Amino acid sequence: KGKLPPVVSSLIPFVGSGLSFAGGPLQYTTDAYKKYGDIFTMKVFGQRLTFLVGPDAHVPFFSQGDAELSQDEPYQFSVPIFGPNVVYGADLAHRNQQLKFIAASLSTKALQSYVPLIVKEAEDFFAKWDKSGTVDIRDALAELIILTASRCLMGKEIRENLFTEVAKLYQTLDEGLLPISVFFPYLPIPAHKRRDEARLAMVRMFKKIIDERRANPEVKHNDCLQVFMDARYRGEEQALNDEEITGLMIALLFAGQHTSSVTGSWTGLLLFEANNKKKFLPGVLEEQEEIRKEFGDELTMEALNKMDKLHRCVKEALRMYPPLLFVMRKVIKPFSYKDYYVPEGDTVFVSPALSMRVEEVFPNADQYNPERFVEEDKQAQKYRFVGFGAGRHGCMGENFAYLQIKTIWSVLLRNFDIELVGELPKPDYTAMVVGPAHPCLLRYTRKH
Amino acid sequence: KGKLPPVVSSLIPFVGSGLSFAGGPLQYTTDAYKKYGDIFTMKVFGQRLTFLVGPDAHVPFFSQGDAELSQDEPYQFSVPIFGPNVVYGADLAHRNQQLKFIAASLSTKALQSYVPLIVKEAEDFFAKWDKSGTVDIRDALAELIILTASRCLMGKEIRENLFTEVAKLYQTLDEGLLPISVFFPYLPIPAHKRRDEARLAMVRMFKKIIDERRANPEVKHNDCLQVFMDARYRGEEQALNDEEITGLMIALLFAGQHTSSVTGSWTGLLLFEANNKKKFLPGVLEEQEEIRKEFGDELTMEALNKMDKLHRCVKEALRMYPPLLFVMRKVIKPFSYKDYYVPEGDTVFVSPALSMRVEEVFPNADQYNPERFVEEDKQAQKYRFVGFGAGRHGCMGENFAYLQIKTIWSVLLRNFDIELVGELPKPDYTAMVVGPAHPCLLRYTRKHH
Ligand code: HEM
Ligand code: HEM
């Protein structure tokens, strides 16, 4: 008699990425780990989500590669943000090489350039503070780091002229990453129109700067933008076009900003708390002076590399409040772990947050002890500390992140003396990148 | 194979309520309407999502009742917000009775009492403003409407003693409603732990106010709290307990606030855009002049209800940028509409946004024309305008809303010259309730003479 109305589409989105926007179920999963042990599963919309906790369990996740574990489906939200044929928009062939061009742009050689530029940038930034006040370091370090990134990662042109422009465009891309945007990246909604618009505006800006530089081999430049122009595929008359270069710029910002920003923020919020400051700031300050004795007052990479106690405080911030809570992969080729079997199609997760609160790995995991890392430096077992992931897809910007954040905090330890305003912040689980919840306040007093 | 590891949870939640937190996909749904006509289905994770567009299609949605269409599944997320055995946390027996008390709290009789309170609050609020400047109208009216609502709904005591406390308790409860919260409302995450604590806190506070009123029993209070204290279920005639009354309060706050505050904001942002002001402000003012001349400078019920041209400026805001984008039901019993059959278990949507952009109903749909309702109000055909739903579960607050927004824009119009700053805001689809996007700014200057 009467028919069904027309079906327009049948959509079955990848559920995994929803954990980044589930509002921080670190509670619910710590329970599950403590009842069922280091491997366990959750069915949601008929999609198996298997979790891997602590070192042993990590091994299948981090030790395997692209034939066995896929990054494509979890990171598919990033394709329209960076553009087509860029990282997770490019076929495997092209992507592995595109990572090589990033790896080059952040190699030790490359950072040697950036360290003077990162140092000036921050010494100038922190000059403008008064003799006194109170300030939200999260907003502070966010400004600073976006500055520092434009200088190092986008060259001198964009930095000193067009920062405001680039800062707003980035802000629009970031504002185009709603919770829907991980399940339907291409859904036509105003936020995604605004996103795609700002992305093209970023390419425009970047064509001008490339073309200006196309005309003038008269200079060679010491920044990522140059590295991306000098990069070529295997054999190919294919160099990297304007869209592609821009993409990798945007991905360097998207990975760069928030993670370094919040970790920098957490580093200081934990150190200048009352109990922590008594126990750990003397260690840290002696070190800044002992570094001054030998190397001088200018911060160089040689000197930043010797700040072990400061490093350990950053790393302890990172251990306790990791900024990315879950890294994930779709299983292309099943594996075994202890008794268990993990099928094709599963989505495996490792949670830095969760794994670095395991007691048999990190004694007193609920408490701030940066000095715990003098013993970790003796353990040879892999995948104990996984804030920066590991294996072949682990964090390429790790040293950058440590240099940026140690520079920031060195310059603040030299010039100012600092106390935390009231209670330590609890983490804000709204956004994809977890940071301390505003307002995150630090009293600064100078010293002549 | 080998041993599958411990599955600790298998869940398939109700997918439909996720459309409320989907970035405002009106584009997509409208592409689908224009291609497939006025009834069509999308599947997400297999679940059928059937949409009904325009007035013919609206009939199966609004004309049926609780036997045929269910509100349980789509409003599931709201249970932990209001509390247990409250509204969608209660069975139909107890729910429709609850809805019947709520209706008493919003009747023509009750509003007669409230309008003096609504007016006083508004005049005092705009009396604090400087000679001139710039205000964010939505921030502004959201503050006024919460103040006004605590007076009228929660009563004398709460408003003039511990406003700051309920306001931040409401803020917590609003903050425990994340996109994850529609799919999994009892997930133990900090935001839900903080929500549950704030709900319980509001009980405790309302136990205080209730017990002190009961020990002083001979006192008339004109407020929703009184009505709910005097309400009794059928047969047994048990009094509503402390947490049930608190629940009904929270539910009225969660209905009243954002929808009125955004609509009120739109009412003024549209009216004062340069073209729309040139075209339509003359008549609003001219209306206000004649009301004063006839009624005196007081704002009573009678004088507001005579404000037909302003009422249309608000009704038109609502037609174009309605705050609730989708109302939905779960089909208990199949039904036929023209050629078609919608089955048991489908989820049916009507989108006030979509359905009031349909040209065959609203000529020049994408155009600001308050005076369209001179003609449009004389239409015999039901379910044409649907900003407030209709039928069994249409908005019981329709009149409070218009009274509150008309009161607001009366005070503003009589006391200031107003201008819009730069671009008319595009709406923001990143909260559940949809409003104009910040910064949404009006320039003001008090009337000189
Ligand atoms: C505290 C700061 C940071 C943290 C915690 C962090 C964390 C991580 C993690 C966990 C991964 C692995 C993702 C996965 O395999 O699924 C990763 C990958 C990566 N990170 Fe970071 N990161 C930080 C800073 C940076 C910075 C500053 C940059 C660049 C300027 C950067 C660039 C990258 C890149 C390119 C990868 C991709 C590696 C690949 O897929 O081969 N990161 N990061
Ligand atoms: C501009 C302001 C408002 C708009 C646009 C609006 C819109 C709506 C809509 C569309 C519905 C139908 C929901 C459905 O069918 O599932 C509804 C129901 C309702 N509204 Fe409103 N509303 C507004 C103001 C208010 C206010 C101020 C209150 C109370 C103080 C209120 C209380 C209710 C109640 C109790 C219902 C439920 C009817 C039921 O389930 O039987 N509304 N509203």
PDB file of all heavy atoms in Angstrom, chain A residues 5 8 144 249 256 344 393:
ATOM      1  N   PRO A   5       9.515   6.546   3.345  1.00  0.00           N
ATOM      2  CA  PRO A   5      10.090   7.730   2.754  1.00  0.00           C
ATOM      3  C   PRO A   5      11.559   7.539   2.386  1.00  0.00           C
ATOM      4  O   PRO A   5      12.276   6.740   3.048  1.00  0.00           O
ATOM      5  CB  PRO A   5       9.925   8.791   3.845  1.00  0.00           C
ATOM      6  CG  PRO A   5       8.973   8.209   4.837  1.00  0.00           C
ATOM      7  CD  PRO A   5       9.212   6.754   4.771  1.00  0.00           C
ATOM      8  N   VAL A   8      18.102   9.303   2.590  1.00  0.00           N
ATOM      9  CA  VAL A   8      18.994  10.281   1.956  1.00  0.00           C
ATOM     10  C   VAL A   8      20.453   9.847   2.028  1.00  0.00           C
ATOM     11  O   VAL A   8      21.194   9.940   1.042  1.00  0.00           O
ATOM     12  CB  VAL A   8      18.843  11.651   2.635  1.00  0.00           C
ATOM     13  CG1 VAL A   8      19.812  12.671   2.038  1.00  0.00           C
ATOM     14  CG2 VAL A   8      17.397  12.122   2.512  1.00  0.00           C
ATOM     15  N   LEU A 144      52.783  33.899  23.889  1.00  0.00           N
ATOM     16  CA  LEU A 144      54.210  33.854  23.640  1.00  0.00           C
ATOM     17  C   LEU A 144      54.525  32.796  22.588  1.00  0.00           C
ATOM     18  O   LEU A 144      55.176  33.075  21.589  1.00  0.00           O
ATOM     19  CB  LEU A 144      54.960  33.593  24.937  1.00  0.00           C
ATOM     20  CG  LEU A 144      56.462  33.317  24.819  1.00  0.00           C
ATOM     21  CD1 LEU A 144      57.195  34.198  23.799  1.00  0.00           C
ATOM     22  CD2 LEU A 144      57.055  33.460  26.214  1.00  0.00           C
ATOM     23  N   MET A 249      52.568  23.735   7.349  1.00  0.00           N
ATOM     24  CA  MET A 249      52.672  24.869   8.270  1.00  0.00           C
ATOM     25  C   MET A 249      51.578  24.802   9.309  1.00  0.00           C
ATOM     26  O   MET A 249      51.841  24.921  10.501  1.00  0.00           O
ATOM     27  CB  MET A 249      52.537  26.191   7.525  1.00  0.00           C
ATOM     28  CG  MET A 249      53.670  26.484   6.570  1.00  0.00           C
ATOM     29  SD  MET A 249      54.966  27.314   7.475  1.00  0.00           S
ATOM     30  CE  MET A 249      56.341  26.364   6.890  1.00  0.00           C
ATOM     31  N   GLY A 256      51.952  22.024  17.459  1.00  0.00           N
ATOM     32  CA  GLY A 256      52.779  22.879  18.300  1.00  0.00           C
ATOM     33  C   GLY A 256      52.127  23.520  19.511  1.00  0.00           C
ATOM     34  O   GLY A 256      52.502  23.230  20.652  1.00  0.00           O
ATOM     35  N   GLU A 344      41.041  -7.844  13.815  1.00  0.00           N
ATOM     36  CA  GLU A 344      40.944  -6.842  12.760  1.00  0.00           C
ATOM     37  C   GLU A 344      39.723  -5.992  13.074  1.00  0.00           C
ATOM     38  O   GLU A 344      38.754  -6.484  13.635  1.00  0.00           O
ATOM     39  CB  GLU A 344      40.775  -7.510  11.396  1.00  0.00           C
ATOM     40  CG  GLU A 344      41.025  -6.586  10.216  1.00  0.00           C
ATOM     41  CD  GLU A 344      40.112  -6.886   9.047  1.00  0.00           C
ATOM     42  OE1 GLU A 344      38.890  -6.666   9.190  1.00  0.00           O
ATOM     43  OE2 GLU A 344      40.605  -7.352   7.996  1.00  0.00           O
ATOM     44  N   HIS A 393      55.713   6.550  15.106  1.00  0.00           N
ATOM     45  CA  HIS A 393      54.849   7.728  15.017  1.00  0.00           C
ATOM     46  C   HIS A 393      54.864   8.575  16.285  1.00  0.00           C
ATOM     47  O   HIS A 393      53.970   9.415  16.477  1.00  0.00           O
ATOM     48  CB  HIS A 393      53.417   7.308  14.630  1.00  0.00           C
ATOM     49  CG  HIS A 393      53.270   6.978  13.181  1.00  0.00           C
ATOM     50  ND1 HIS A 393      53.471   7.911  12.184  1.00  0.00           N
ATOM     51  CD2 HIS A 393      52.968   5.819  12.553  1.00  0.00           C
ATOM     52  CE1 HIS A 393      53.307   7.339  11.004  1.00  0.00           C
ATOM     53  NE2 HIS A 393      53.000   6.070  11.201  1.00  0.00           N
TER      54      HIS A 393
END
